Design a protein around this ligand. Structure first.
Ligand SMILES: [Zn+2]
Lengths: 104, 7
């Protein structure tokens, strides 16, 4: 029921915080460098460090700008914080295989 | 590295 950084165990999110964006919490997407990600949407996350300023370029979610989200402890890329949108204004898209699920 | 982290 909680998600930790797979690399270092930093607390990041919770199963209760999964958000079905466009009907599903899971989106399979690729970036311009052709990397494929299995992204899980969460309402809320913690223990991250957001780097840079938001960008609308190549956004996988209509009306949202993204900032890269690193693990605040180990600096591992865990996904993106999304903002600037509507219903909801903000959320997190985290890469499923970079998280470890386990007991609270 | 930044290219691989872009959404
Ligand atoms: Zn970490």
């Amino acid at each position: 029921s909680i998600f930790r950084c797979r690399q270092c165990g930093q607390t990041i999110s919770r199963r209760d915080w999964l958000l079905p964006m466009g009907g599903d919490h899971e989106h399979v997407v690729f970036n311009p460098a052709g990397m494929i990600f299995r992204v899980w949407c969460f309402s809320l996350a913690q223990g991250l460090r957001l780097i840079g300023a938001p960008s609308g370029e190549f956004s996988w979610f209509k009306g949202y700008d993204w900032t890269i989200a690193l693990c605040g402890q180990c600096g591992s890329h865990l996904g993106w914080h999304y903002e600037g949108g509507s219903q909801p204004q903000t959320f997190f898209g985290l890469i499923k295989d970079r998280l470890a699920e386990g007991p609270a | 590295f930044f290219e691989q982290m872009q959404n």
